[PDB]
Every structure is written in structure tokens, then in C-alpha cells.
Design brief:
- Chain B: It comes from Homo sapiens (Human).
- Chain B: It is found in: Nucleus membrane; Nucleus, Nuclear pore complex; Chromosome, Centromere, Kinetochore.
- Chain B: This is Nuclear pore complex protein Nup107.
- Chain B: Belongs to the nucleoporin Nup84/Nup107 family.
- This is part of a larger assembly, with two copies of chain A, one copy of chain B and one copy of chain D.
- By secondary structure, chain A is mostly helical.
- Chain A is about 35% helix and about 0% strand.
- The longest helix of chain A is centred in the last third of the chain and has 15 residues.
- Chain B is built from four helices and no strands.
- The longest helix of chain B has 14 residues.
- By secondary structure, chain D is an all-alpha fold.
- In chain D, α5 packs antiparallel against α6.
- Classes of the chains: A mainly alpha, B mainly alpha, D mainly alpha.
- Chains in contact: A-C, B-D, C-D.
- Chains B and D meet through loops of B and loops of D.
């Protein structure tokens, strides 16, 4: 949650892919480290349901752009390991 | 030759060899790498040699 | 009691089934195929349309398969809550997840390809008939093709939109005014328009009503009209190429391999005759380009806008060359020879300006594709290019080009 | 000697002898020699396989083959008929069409770029050579298509070579 709150989940200028744009986020960079250090993201990560039911996220817990970009990157990085 | 003189405890003779190497030489080995004949990274004998010359100076 | 014993019911069950129920259950079967639970996706299909039923079963089948394809073209992107005040409470949509319109348009195209797989793999493609389209009957396999040609062109239109924004936003506003709809203030005109891919073509009437208006309100002493003509032509060009290129590169994935019957006169959207018909769009722009741009333009602008006009005239004649391949010369000759004369007239009406403006490569690249022997022969004498004329006297020989040329030399030549 | 190598299928030996003999300017002037070189380089490519070695030998032999085509084409334009020049240019076209797949940055990628330039120069030369004998043909159509050929053969960018400091070979 505090990694996701260091990352700027505000919307871009309407031309630009949220799986390309996410690759400078520190959350995606720690997922890329866990993958390069050998860990199964399918077992090591909390549920995308309940990472969204945690209250720590605060302002992000009302942001739909954050709600699909989080899901789109979980889908991309976990279904990339099957 | 400095690797010999420092092991032989001839620290002034190693400094005489250090003064035989002109002080521009570390930049001149980069000048000779951007005009081509070599590639954008320094030759791997000579980056290691510049690092070794900087170890010897220290 | 309760469990295995309480009557599982709630939305009625099998001994009634209305036409909403057929679509809401065929949507369940497609969603089960999108879980790869093929065993149940088939059992819902083989119940809903069981293969011992009346001849009217297939008039519901073409309809439900068409409606589910329209619902998938026009799907609401339920990841974006700008739509959370702007979606109906019953809506069995397809939940396009990507928070950008280009990726909603790609994801609709990915899902449409899986709807075509569902239609092959549960056998259904063998049953498709001719759904009513544009006030005629049209073979439903070609309507499912057209719906992905509309998606193919919407992906182009959204990529020119991300370069040419307020030209396209104004044509979108004119098109949406032609639907009389209120735009939700939580959205943009582009989000409302790129919902409705079933109607993405109406932009091509409106872009010319904006171009005609710039050609009424602006000074000819500016560059801005020349950039509008270039940019509107590139939008028409690349969309109409993305339509016919899709049609050509998937010409297997929409085809009956056998038939004992007569499929109707197929008029795709790109070949529409009418007030907003894409033929009348290409004709309006051929009037506009030749009466407004070509007189005012420089040597280089005249080339750009000629290669553009060549790409529009090519889609126009591709649209007749398709039509003259579903009308039959043996058993609808009364339609055929008269559609063939409509083609032969408009072939010369559109290409004779390329000849008269001295663009002999662009008149001829086209006339060599569509067998227009008068403008082939005229370009040869207007260049004295007897070697290219001899090349035609070889190239078109199964089609009597020499017998035609010998009239052309006898008469006036 | 190249007959006596190729009949014994000593094909790499024949090409290695060409790699020495091509240094004699008094062989590079012969149409007969350049014809033998171009055909020997094909017959060696027609013996190479899917191996990691051969992906280097095939590069040399195609750089050699395109350069030998460009010199054989210069000699054929200068010494032979118009149809003799067509069938050679159409053989050079066929040899460019294979190498055209290798979008990259090696000296076959560099040779292929320069050899588009020599191909269009020789094609423009063939159209004006056709004009020199074709008594019934209009000079405008030949000189237009030749001017297009020279415009392409001018605009092909000059090779951006790296001068090193031991290599006294031009």
C-alpha cells in the first residue's frame, strides 16, 4: 500500500498505455525484482480484492484509474508466470 | 613497471614511472574512443588499466 | 428439504423461453465459452435452438447472434466510473477493462474474434442465414464481418484522433448532433462516440460537412484549408483501407465453404449508396477536391491529394467489384447489366479527371486494376507511349483490348 | 582451376582462391572471370546449411556476390548486348531480394545499402543503353525511368566508415 502511495496513479494525456506507463512505478519495479529473484507472484502476493479493502490506500481507494491500472498490472505480471 | 617497483619497496622509482605518464593520458584514451577505430565504451584492457593507474596514484 | 429439492427456477425455466430469454441465455453460453467450459456452453445452445425445431428457429438465431455482436461493438467500459451515472441497471455488457479508448477498441476486437470462434466451435456458423441490414436482406456471416471492419476502422479513427484532435472532436459533435443525444458531462464527445462502433461510419458524412464549412468560412490565402483537406482525406483513406484490408485478410473466417442456395446482394457499409452513403461521401469529396483544392494547390500538394483521391476512388470501385460478385448474371441479369452500367459510368466519371489533369501514373494504376480501356488507350496516345500500349495489347488479351483499341483508332484517333 | 575445383566440389577452396585472385586487377577487368566468380559464389551458397559457422560464410559470400554482380554489370553494360544486360540485372535483382531480409548493422547490411545504389545506377544505365539501339522507342519514357534510377542512385547514403590507423588499404 505505501509503495502504491509513492507511485503517481493520476491519469495521463489520453494517448498512452497503462502497462507501458506503469513500468516506472516502484510497485511494478518490486514485482520485476521478485520475478528476477525467482519468487512465485501467484503465491507471494495478497489478493487484488483485499489489497483494495485495506484502508491505508486512503485517497487511492476512490480512484478508478488506480482500480484498473492495479488490476491490469496484477493480471499482466501474474498471468506472465503460468 | 610500477607493480614491480612498489613490490620491490622502490616507492620513489614507482613515482618516477608515474611522472613518465603524462597527466592528460586518462582523457586522451577517451578522445581516441569517440572518433571511432574503437567503440563508445573504452577497450576492456584499458578501462581496467586506467582503474589500476588510479589505484597506483592513490 | 432445501438443497437438491428446492425448485431452481427464479427467471422461469425451459418450457416457455421468450426472445429476451434467448439472448440473455446465449450471452450466458458465450460467457461460459469465455470460461472455456465448452461442455455447458454447448448444452445451453443445443437447448435454446434444439436441432428438431421449426424453420423460424433460425430467424431467432441470426437475430440473437447479430444482437450479441452489436452489444459487443457498442459495449460499455465498466472499469471507468465516468460511466457509473450512464449505464442501465440490467445491462448484460462485456466489461471492457482497459482505461483508454484505443485499448477498449482493441479489446472489443479481441472479444469479437472469440465470438467468431464460439460461432465456429459450437457449430453455429453452419446455420447462419440473412439478417435484414440497411432495408435489404444481407448474409449474416458478412454482417459479422462488417462489424469487425467497423472495429478495424474505429481503431484507425482513434489513432488519427490522437493526432488531429479538434478536427475529429468537431466531426464527432456533428455526428452526435445527428443522433440528437445529450452528452453526459462526466464524459467527452469522444467517449460517447467510441461507445457506438455500430455507427462509426456516420463521421464520414460530418467530416465533409466540416470540410465544406471551412471551404465556405476561411480565406484561400491560408494554409489551414490545405491541412484540413489533407487530414480529412487521410481519415477517410486509412479507415476505408482498414475496412477492405480486414475483409481481404479474414476472407476465410466469414465464408460458407459449401451452399445449395442463393445468398442476397451483399452491400457492405463501404459501398453504401444513399444521402450519407460512403459512395456519396467519396463523390462529394471528388467534387470538393477537383473544384476547390486542385485549382488552388501547388505542385507538391497536388501530388499528396492525388494519391489520397486514388485511395478513395479505389474503395468506391472495390465496392462495385464486390456487388457485381453477389448479383448473378444467370438469374438476376435485370439487376446485373444495370448495376454494371452504373459501375461503367462512374468508373469514367471518377477517373477522367486524373487523365485530364495529366496524372498519367495515377489514372493508369487505377485503370489497369479496373479494366478501363478508353482511359488506358487515351493515356497512351496523350504520352505517345506505344510500348506501354503494346504492353496492354499483351496484358489484357483474354479481355479483347486489341479489338477495342482498333475501334479507338478507326473512330476519332 | 575453378572448373577443376567445382567439378571436384571443392567449393570453399574455389571461393578462397577467388578471395586471393580478386586482388589481381588484371582478373577483375575480365567479364569471363567476373562471370566465373559470380557463378562460383552461388554454387558455394547452394552448399551452405543451418549451422553457426555458415551464418558467417554466407555473409562473406553474399557481400562478395553483390560486389561481383556490380562489377560484372559494369562490364556487361560496357561490352555486351541489351538482353545480355537484362538477364544479368534480373539475376542481381534476385540476389538482392534474399539479402533484403537482413535488416541490421553488419558490413553485409552496409554492402546491401550501397548495392541498392549500384543496382539503380545500372538499371538507369540499361534504360539509356536500350535507347542507344531501340530505333522505334520514345526517348522521354526511357530517360524519365533512367532519371528516377539516378535519383535513387544519388540519394542512397554514402557509407559512414570508421577510419582506423593500421589499415593502408583503400
Amino acid at each position: 500500500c505505501k509503495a502504491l502511495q509513492r507511485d503517481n496513479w493520476s491519469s495521463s494525456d489520453g494517448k498512452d498505455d497503462p502497462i507501458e506507463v506503469s513500468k516506472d512505478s516502484i510497485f511494478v519495479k518490486i514485482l520485476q525484482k521478485l520475478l528476477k529473484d525467482g519468487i512465485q507472484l501467484s503465491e507471494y502476493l495478497p489478493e487484488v480484492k483485499d489489497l483494495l479493502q485495506a484502508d491505508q490506500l486512503g485517497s487511492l481507494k476512490s480512484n478508478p484509474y488506480f482500480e484498473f491500472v492495479l488490476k491490469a498490472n496484477y493480471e499482466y505480471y501474474v498471468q506472465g508466470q503460468i | 613497471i610500477m607493480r614491480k617497483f612498489l613490490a620491490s619497496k622502490k616507492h620513489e622509482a614507482a613515482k618516477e614511472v608515474f611522472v613518465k605518464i603524462p597527466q592528460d593520458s586518462i582523457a586522451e584514451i577517451y578522445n581516441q574512443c569517440e572518433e571511432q577505430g574503437m567503440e563508445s565504451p573504452l577497450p576492456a584492457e584499458d578501462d581496467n588499466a586506467i582503474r589500476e593507474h588510479l589505484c597506483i596514484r592513490a | 428439504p432445501n438443497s437438491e429439492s428446492m425448485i431452481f427456477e427464479t427467471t422461469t425455466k425451459n418450457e416457455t423461453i421468450a426472445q429476451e430469454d434467448k439472448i440473455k441465455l446465449l450471452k450466458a453460453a458465450f460467457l461460459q465459452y469465455c470460461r472455456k467450459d465448452l461442455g455447458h456452453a454447448q448444452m445451453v445452445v443445443d437447448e435454446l435452438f434444439s436441432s428438431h425445431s421449426d424453420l423460424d428457429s433460425d430467424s431467432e438465431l441470426d437475430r440473437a447472434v447479430t444482437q450479441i455482436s452489436v452489444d459487443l461493438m457498442d459495449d460499455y467500459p465498466a472499469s471507468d466510473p465516468r460511466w457509473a451515472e450512464s449505464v442501465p441497471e440490467e445491462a448484460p455488457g462485456f466489461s471492457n477493462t482497459s482505461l483508454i479508448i484505443l485499448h477498449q477498441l482493441e479489446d472489443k476486437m479481441k472479444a469479437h474474434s472469440f465470438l467468431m470462434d464460439f460461432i465456429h466451435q459450437v457449430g453455429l456458423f453452419g446455420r447462419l442465414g440473412s439478417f435484414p441490414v440497411r432495408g435489404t436482406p444481407m448474409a449474416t456471416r458478412l454482417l459479422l464481418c462488417e462489424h469487425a471492419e467497423k472495429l478495424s476502422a474505429a481503431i484507425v479513427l482513434k489513432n488519427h484522433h490522437s493526432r488531429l484532435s479538434d478536427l475529429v472532436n468537431t466531426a464527432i459533435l456533428i455526428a452526435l448532433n445527428k443522433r440528437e443525444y445529450e452528452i453526459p458531462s462526466n464524459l467527452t464527445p469522444a467517449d460517447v462516440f467510441f461507445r457506438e462502433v455500430s455507427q462509426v461510419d456516420t463521421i464520414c458524412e460530418c467530416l465533409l460537412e466540416h470540410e465544406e464549412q471551412v471551404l465556405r468560412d476561411a480565406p484561400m490565402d491560408s494554409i489551414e484549408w490545405a491541412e484540413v483537406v489533407i487530414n480529412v482525406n487521410n481519415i477517410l483513406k486509412d479507415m476505408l483501407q482498414a475496412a477492405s484490408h480486414y475483409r481481404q485478410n479474414r476472407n476465410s473466417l466469414y465464408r460458407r465453404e459449401e451452399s445449395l442456395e442463393k445468398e442476397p446482394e451483399y452491400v457492405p457499409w463501404t459501398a453504401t449508396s444513399g444521402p450519407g452513403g460512403i459512395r456519396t461521401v467519396i463523390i462529394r469529396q471528388h467534387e470538393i477536391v477537383l473544384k476547390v483544392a486542385y485549382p488552388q494547390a501547388d505542385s507538391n500538394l497536388r501530388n499528396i491529394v492525388t494519391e489520397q483521391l486514388v485511395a478513395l476512388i479505389d474503395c468506391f470501385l472495390d465496392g462495385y467489384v464486390s456487388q457485381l460478385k453477389s448479383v448473378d448474371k444467370s438469374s438476376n441479369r435485370e439487376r446485373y447489366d444495370n448495376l454494371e452500367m452504373e459501375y461503367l459510368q462512374k468508373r469514367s466519371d471518377l477517373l477522367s479527371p486524373l487523365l485530364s489533369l495529366g496524372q498519367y501514373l495515377w489514372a493508369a494504376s487505377l485503370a489497369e486494376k479496373y479494366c478501363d480501356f478508353d482511359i488506358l488507350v487515351q493515356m497512351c496516345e496523350q504520352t505517345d507511349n506505344q510500348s506501354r500500349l503494346q504492353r496492354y495489347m499483351t496484358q489484357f488479351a483474354d479481355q479483347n483490348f486489341s479489338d477495342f483499341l482498333f475501334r479507338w483508332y478507326l473512330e476519332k484517333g | 582451376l575453378v572448373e577443376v575445383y567445382r567439378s571436384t566440389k571443392r567449393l570453399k577452396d574455389a571461393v578462397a582462391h577467388c578471395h586471393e585472385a580478386e586482388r589481381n586487377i588484371a582478373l577483375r577487368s575480365s567479364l569471363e572471370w567476373n562471370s566465373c566468380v559470380v557463378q562460383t559464389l552461388k554454387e558455394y551458397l547452394e552448399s551452405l546449411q543451418c549451422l553457426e559457422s555458415d551464418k558467417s560464410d554466407w555473409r562473406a559470400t553474399n557481400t562478395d556476390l553483390l560486389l561481383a554482380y556490380a562489377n560484372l554489370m559494369l562490364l556487361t553494360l560496357s561490352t555486351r548486348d541489351v538482353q545480355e544486360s537484362r538477364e544479368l540485372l534480373q539475376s542481381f535483382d534476385s540476389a538482392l531480394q534474399s539479402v533484403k531480409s537482413l535488416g541490421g548493422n553488419d558490413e553485409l547490411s552496409a554492402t546491401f545499402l550501397e548495392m541498392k545504389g549500384h543496382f539503380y545506377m545500372h538499371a538507369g544505365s540499361l534504360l539509356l543503353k536500350m535507347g542507344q539501339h531501340s530505333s522505334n522507342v520514345q526517348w522521354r519514357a526511357l530517360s524519365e525511368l533512367a532519371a528516377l534510377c539516378y535519383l535513387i542512385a544519388f540519394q542512397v547514403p554514402r557509407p559512414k566508415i570508421k577510419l582506423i590507423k593500421g589499415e593502408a588499404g583503400q
